[PDB]
Amino acid sequence: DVYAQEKQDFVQHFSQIVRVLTEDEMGHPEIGDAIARLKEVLEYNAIGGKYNRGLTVVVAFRELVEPRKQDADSLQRAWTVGWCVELLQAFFLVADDIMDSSLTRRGQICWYQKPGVGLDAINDANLLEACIYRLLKLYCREQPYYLNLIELFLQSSYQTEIGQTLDLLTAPNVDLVRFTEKRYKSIVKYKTAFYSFYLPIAAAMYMAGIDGEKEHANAKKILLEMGEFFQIQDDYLDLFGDPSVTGKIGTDIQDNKCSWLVVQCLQRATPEQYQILKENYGQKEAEKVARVKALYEELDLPAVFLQYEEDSYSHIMALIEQYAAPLPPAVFLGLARKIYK
Amino acid sequence: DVYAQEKQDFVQHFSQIVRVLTEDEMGHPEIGDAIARLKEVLEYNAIGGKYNRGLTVVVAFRELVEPRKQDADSLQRAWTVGWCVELLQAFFLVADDIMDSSLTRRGQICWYQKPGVGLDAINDANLLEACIYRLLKLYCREQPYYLNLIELFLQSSYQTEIGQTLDLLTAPNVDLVRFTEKRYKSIVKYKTAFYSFYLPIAAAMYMAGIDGEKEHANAKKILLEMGEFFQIQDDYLDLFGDPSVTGKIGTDIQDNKCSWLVVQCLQRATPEQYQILKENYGQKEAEKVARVKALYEELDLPAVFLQYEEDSYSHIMALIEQYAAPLPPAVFLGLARKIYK
Ligand SMILES: Cc1ccc(-c2cc3c(N[C@H](Cc4cccc(F)c4)P(=O)(O)O)ncnc3s2)cc1Cl
Ligand SMILES: Cc1ccc(-c2cc3c(N[C@H](Cc4cccc(F)c4)P(=O)(O)O)ncnc3s2)cc1Cl
Ligand SMILES: Cc1ccc(-c2cc3c(N[C@H](Cc4cccc(F)c4)P(=O)(O)O)ncnc3s2)cc1Cl
Ligand SMILES: Cc1ccc(-c2cc3c(N[C@H](Cc4cccc(F)c4)P(=O)(O)O)ncnc3s2)cc1Cl
Ligand SMILES: [Cl-]
Ligand SMILES: [Cl-]
Ligand SMILES: [Cl-]
Ligand SMILES: [Cl-]
Numbered sequence: 189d190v191y192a193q194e195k196q197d198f199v200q201h202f203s204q205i206v207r208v209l210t211e212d213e214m215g216h217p218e219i220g221d222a223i224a225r226l227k228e229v230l231e232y233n234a235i236g237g238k239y240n241r242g243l244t245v246v247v248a249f250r251e252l253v254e255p256r257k258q259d260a261d262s263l264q265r266a267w268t269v270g271w272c273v274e275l276l277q278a279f280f281l282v283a284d285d286i287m288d289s290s291l292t293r294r295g296q297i298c299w300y301q302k303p304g305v306g307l308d309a310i311n312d313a314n315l316l317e318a319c320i321y322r323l324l325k326l327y328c329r330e331q332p333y334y335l336n337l338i339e340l341f342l343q344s345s346y347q348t349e350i351g352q353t354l355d356l357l358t359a360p361n362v363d364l365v366r367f368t369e370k371r372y373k374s375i376v377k378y379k380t381a382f383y384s385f386y387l388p389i390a391a392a393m394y395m396a397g398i399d400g401e402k403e404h405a406n407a408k409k410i411l412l413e414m415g416e417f418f419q420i421q422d423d424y425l426d427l428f429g430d431p432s433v434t435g436k437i438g439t440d441i442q443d444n445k446c447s448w449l450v451v452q453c454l455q456r457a458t459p460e461q462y463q464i465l466k467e468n469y470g471q472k473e474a475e476k477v478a479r480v481k482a483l484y485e486e487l488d489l490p491a492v493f494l495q496y497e498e499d500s501y502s503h504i505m506a507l508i509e510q511y512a513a514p515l516p517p518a519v520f521l522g523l524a525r526k527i528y529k
Numbered sequence: 530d531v532y533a534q535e536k537q538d539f540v541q542h543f544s545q546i547v548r549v550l551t552e553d554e555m556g557h558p559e560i561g562d563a564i565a566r567l568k569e570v571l572e573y574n575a576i577g578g579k580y581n582r583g584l585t586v587v588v589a590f591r592e593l594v595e596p597r598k599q600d601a602d603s604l605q606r607a608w609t610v611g612w613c614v615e616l617l618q619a620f621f622l623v624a625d626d627i628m629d630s631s632l633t634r635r636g637q638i639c640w641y642q643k644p645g646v647g648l649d650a651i652n653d654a655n656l657l658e659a660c661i662y663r664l665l666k667l668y669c670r671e672q673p674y675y676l677n678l679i680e681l682f683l684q685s686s687y688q689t690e691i692g693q694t695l696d697l698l699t700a701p702n703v704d705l706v707r708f709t710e711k712r713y714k715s716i717v718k719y720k721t722a723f724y725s726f727y728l729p730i731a732a733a734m735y736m737a738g739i740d741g742e743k744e745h746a747n748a749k750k751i752l753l754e755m756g757e758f759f760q761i762q763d764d765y766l767d768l769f770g771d772p773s774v775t776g777k778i779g780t781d782i783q784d785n786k787c788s789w790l791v792v793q794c795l796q797r798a799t800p801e802q803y804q805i806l807k808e809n810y811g812q813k814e815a816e817k818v819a820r821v822k823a824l825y826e827e828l829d830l831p832a833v834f835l836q837y838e839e840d841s842y843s844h845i846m847a848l849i850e851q852y853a854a855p856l857p858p859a860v861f862l863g864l865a866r867k868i869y870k
Pocket of ligand 1: 294
């Protein structure tokens with residue numbers, strides 16, 4: 189895996205990221221204590237995932253730039269912009285965990301639940317966001333793609349926050365008339381797909397001098413469709429995934445989520461089934477969760493999913509055929525491989 | 530007051546700000562509901578203050594640009610960038626009110642305390658921040674100062690968040706050994722002074738083509754000192770201000786704040802007085818608040834303040850004399866007039 193290869197160098201760079209972000213403690217004694225807390229926030233929240241989004245920046249950059257133009261400095265910058273994607277993500281998650289009242293994340297206590305953090309985590313989340321722009325300036329300010337990357341990260345933030353707003357309005361209070369296919373697809377596009385799939389490839393593209401609006405729009409069309417499939421599979425696996433394979437155990441039903449599953453169930457159910465759903469969806473008690481799952485099985489949603497997975501795979505391959513050029517198809521196929529596996 | 534003059538046109542522009550931010554509902558039906566919530570967030574949180582910071586952008590712009598170069602479009606842009614300062618502020622306050630567990634703000638129920646908002650206000654705060662960059666792009670993207678303003682707002686955000694972190698570490702848990710003059714001045718500089726005083730003049734300067742680092746640094750030296758005095762007076766007035774004149778009633782002592790007053794008190798008190806402070810500071814009960822106030826009076830802190838106000842006034846005037854050029858002194862004197870009144 190081209191991801192397994194760059195991974196070591198990527199995680200190693202994190203040390204440098206932290207050092208440079210905290211080096212103002214050398215210019216500004218007065219803020220020492222705050223900079224110490226920033227360092228703690230970075231190490232607890234930016235480390236510990238799989239880094240797929242950040243690494244995607246580095247892999248794509250290596251495929252898109254002639255080897256002649258990939259000097260030590262070029263690659264410092266790619267590792268930094270990859271880490272900027274991971275910091276964006278850490279900003280979203282710290283804030284989301286507060287808003288959802290989550291306990292754990294990535295098999296750890298959520299930052300805001302830590303003794304002595306609490307709602308101070310809101311400012312901590314904001315600093316994680318701010319760090320992105322500190323890093324872009326420190327590493328990329330003299331580059332022709334500087335302003336392109338600032339605007340891409342700011343737009344990625346807005347799209348994701350819009351998606352969150354839509355999600356919060358949809359899944360406050362237990363209600364299913366909200367849980368439509370058009371609304372589900374909208375949430376996924378704004379809240380997940382733009383920042384997870386479009387943003388890291390887009391960033392690599394700008395870094396490689398590929399700034400044309402048509403090329404960005406072509407890549408976007410492939411990448412938002414990949415993001416849609418990725419979330420749908422995530423929603424499917426939450427309930428039907430082996431938890432020792434996926435690393436989560438699902439609470440979508442307990443948590444009244446607008447999951448792909450419940451959207452499909454509502455398209456398919458009878459009035460009687462609607463009731464079994466309405467009576468059981470979004471309860472803590474486990475017998476209520478068994479009865480939602482059972483209804484999903486009665487309606488063969490696993491079969492529906494596998495069908496959707498196959499269709500989705502043809503469609504993505506067609507999209508790559510038609511819209512990849514002039515990027516190397518491998519940019520898109522490497523992603524497709526990671527998620528349809 | 531040059532502020533009273535521009536004020537009508539400034540508040541009138543808000544309608545247009547909202548219209549343009551919500552006009553994507555015309556490109557993107559799917560996100561209609563989210564855009565409706567954005568509109569509600571903007572109207573509840575961006576309206577209702579005195580707009581001193583935003584208006585400062587417009588007044589300074591009018592003093593700094595030859596009248597020949599102040600066309601209808603120039604002024605649209607100045608009103609927009611003024612509103613960007615007010616949106617930055619609304620982002621800070623919505624988030625701060627959550628973190629402090631405040632009930633009211635500007636004589637209204639805090640947004641997050643509204644039925645059905647709660648911690649969703651965190652995402653609402655983030656959208657207010659995002660709106661800044663939407664507006665800069667929509668109104669200023671073709672301008673030579675575009676990237677200058679993006680960087681100024683992003684830096685203003687970082688400085689303020691750093692200041693918040695320092696504040697949160699200083700005033701968590703009741704403790705006064707933290708409450709030193711050096712720490713107080715650091716909090717004020719980062720958390721208040723950069724965004725309240727430097728940011729709006731700086732923005733006007735870039736808009737006028739004044740981008741030199743020395744000119745920005747000269748203006749900064751005056752403006753951070755003005756910001757320091759403004760907070761100290763705010764801290765003084767909280768306890769000794771007529772509330773029907775100031776529009777607040779003070780809770781600095783109840784809330785364990787690192788207020789200028791308690792910093793001065795700790796420099797001056799005996800071991801016995803320290804104890805009276807320690808036993809009473811940061812309690813709800815009113816007899817405990819009367820006894821802090823009484824100690825401040827025993828130590829003539831009002832006299833100390835008036836002395837500090839006079840000194841601070843000489844010093845600011847000296848700074849204007851020495852560092853204003855080549856800006857018109859009136860840029861600085863208009864501010865000084867608003868706050869030493
Ligand atoms: C751009 C991008 C974004 C995300 C991913 C992947 C995430 C992921 C993954 N993520 C976990 C969450 C998860 C767990 C099971 C299935 C699933 F789709 C996602 P976590 O965020 O805890 O590392 N787990 C297993 N395989 C993959 S592949 C891969 C790419 Cl190429
Ligand atoms: C770019 C790309 C994308 C996907 C794949 C493959 C996916 C896959 C595969 N995917 C399964 C999903 C699946 C199962 C049945 C039909 C279908 F189209 C897709 P799973 O994620 O369950 O391992 N199963 C067996 N072989 C392969 S080969 C291989 C490549 Cl090179
Ligand atoms: C750049 C800038 C920033 C703030 C101000 C002022 C704020 C202010 C003011 N602000 C109120 C808060 C307050 C209330 C009493 C004293 C004080 F210093 C500040 P609010 O934020 O509720 O409008 N009240 C009375 N006079 C003034 S003058 C003036 C300028 Cl030039
Ligand atoms: C640029 C500027 C700045 C401040 C002032 C004035 C402040 C002031 C003034 N300030 C009082 C504060 C004060 C009270 C005594 C001495 C002192 F230096 C300052 P307050 O805010 O209590 O009205 N009191 C009486 N006259 C004036 S004139 C006038 C101008 Cl033009
Ligand atoms: Cl270089
Ligand atoms: Cl888009
Ligand atoms: Cl024009
Ligand atoms: Cl500074």
